[PDB]
Amino acid sequence: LLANLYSCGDQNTLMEESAEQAQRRDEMLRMYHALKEALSIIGNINT
């Protein structure tokens, strides 16, 4: 099966992501950075 799937042309279009995943990973990156900033502020307040 793996060799048959790979041999089909246009591998760049066979594995294209759906628009939902582009949204999911973009949001998780923003959430990840925001959490770090928030945890930084708490560290600088406890002091």
Binding site: L5, Q11, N12, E16, Y32, L35, A38, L39
Partner: protein
């Protein structure tokens, strides 16, 4: 609280932050992961291999097919052979086998002629059992592809390729089934578990 959230999200965003759309390495790594997932899910439903057992349904291909091999015996007994027409044709067979002679012992060709007529009937339930099993397999393949939703054009192709293969194997499977019945007509072995001596 914030520390726990970072730990949960970190394992995935580690990859998302390096995303580039022009990355053949990601596409091929994704391809190998989807194919390995499908082959593990497929074997799970049919063979029962793995530690992820569905305790709500019947396993699908594994136990639907396992029962097709126990509905099939039912198909082999719905024959309804008419006893009266047997006893008539047995009588005419004996007289015609003896022919011009009065006959001294019961003929064998009468026994062979009757059996060959009944054995020819089995062809129907055998070609049903094949169609039933093909249909069940196509079902289980369609369940296994439900996990590739995040990749369109890969759920279609993997369905098409595995589906086409299962269908093309129908011809060769039926030919062997037909042949195994001809083998039964070709020679009458009476030295088996039978009324020897009687």
């Amino acid at each position: 609280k914030l520390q726990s959230q970072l730990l949960s999200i970190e394992k995935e965003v580690e990859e998302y932050k390096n995303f580039r759309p022009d990355d053949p390495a990601r596409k091929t790594k994704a391809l190998l992961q989807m194919v390995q997932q499908f082959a593990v899910d497929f074997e799970k439903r049919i063979e029962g291999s793995g530690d992820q057992i569905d305790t709500y349904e019947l396993s699908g291909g594994a136990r639907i097919n396992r029962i097709f091999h126990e509905r099939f015996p039912f198909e082999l007994v719905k024959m309804e052979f008419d006893e009266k027409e047997l006893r008539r044709e047995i009588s005419y067979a004996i007289k015609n086998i003896h022919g011009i002679r009065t006959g001294l012992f019961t003929p064998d060709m009468a026994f062979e002629t009757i059996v060959k007529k009944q054995v020819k009937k089995i062809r129907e339930p055998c070609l049903k059992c094949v169609d039933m099993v093909i249909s069940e397999l196509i079902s289980t393949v369609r369940q296994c592809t439900k996990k590739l939703q995040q990749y369109p054009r890969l759920r279609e192709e993997m369905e098409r390729i595995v589906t086409t293969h299962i269908r093309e194997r129908e011809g060769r499977t039926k030919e062997q089934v037909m042949l195994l019945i001809d083998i039964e007509l070709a020679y009458m072995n009476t030295n088996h578990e039978d009324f020897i001596g009687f």
